[PDB]
Amino acid sequence: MQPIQIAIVALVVAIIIAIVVWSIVIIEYRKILRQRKIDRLIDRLIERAEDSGNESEGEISALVELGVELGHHAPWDVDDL
Numbered sequence: 001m002q003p004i005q006i007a008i009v010a011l012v013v014a015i016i017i018a019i020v021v022w023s024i025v026i027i028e029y030r031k032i033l034r035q036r037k038i039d040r041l042i043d044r045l046i047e048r049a050e051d052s053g054n055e056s057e058g059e060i061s062a063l064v065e066l067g068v069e070l071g072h073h074a075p076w077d078v079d080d081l
Contacts, residue, residue, distance in 0.1 A: 023081070
C-alpha cells in the first residue's frame with residue numbers, strides 16, 4: 001500500500017517555488033509590502049534630472065570579485081539563493 005509516482009522531480013520543483021514564494025514573506029513582512037516605496041524610485045530619477053545618466057553596470061561587479069576574493073568574507077555569500 002506504499003505510494004508510487006512516475007518521478008520525484010515534480011516534488012522537487014514544488015519545493016523550489018515554495019522557497020521563492022515564501023522568500024517575499026521572509027524578506028518582506030505581510031503587514032507592510034514596502035514594495036510600493038521602491039516604485040517611487042522612478043520618480044526620484046526624474047526629480048534628479050529629466051536626462052538620466054551618471055550610472056554604470058557590469059563594470060562595477062568586475063571589481064567586486066577582486067574585493068570579495070581578496071576579503072575573507074563579504075556581505076554576499078557563495079549562495080546566491
